[PDB]
Amino acid sequence: EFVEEFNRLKTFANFPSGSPVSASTLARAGFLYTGEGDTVRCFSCHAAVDRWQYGDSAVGRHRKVSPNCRFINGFYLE
């Protein structure tokens, strides 16, 4: 279901507009919005990432927190 980026993007309703990282960027990096604050969680490795700050890379933070995530490693590539 969440293999599709659009389905991930739909979980971002009410995502804080004041966040330095956008909902589209986070969805692209494999994240789903948990609904609380700025906490997102990867559909694949289940790692959660929060406390986003200016200059952050959605993919960069994702790799840092979960270096062996299959999604980031291209496991779902058609």
Give the residue from 65, 72, 49 showing the smallest Cα distance to 41: 49
Taking the least distance from each CB to Zn ion, the nearer of 17 and 31 is 31
Q: How far is the CB of 7 from a copy of itself (least distance, A)?
A: 7
Tokens in use for 20?
Answer: 């330095």
Report the partner that residue 2 touches, choosing among a copy of itself, Zn ion, none (CB closer than 5 to 8 A by kind): none
Taking the least distance from each CB to Zn ion, the nearer of 32 and 45 is 45
Give the residue from 49, 77, 43 showing the smallest Cα distance to 63: 49
Give the residue from 54, 60, 53 showing the smallest Cα distance to 30: 60
Which residues bind to a copy of itself, rule: CB under 8 A? Answer: 4, 6-7, 9-10, 12-15, 23-24, 28-29, 57, 59, 72, 74, 77-78
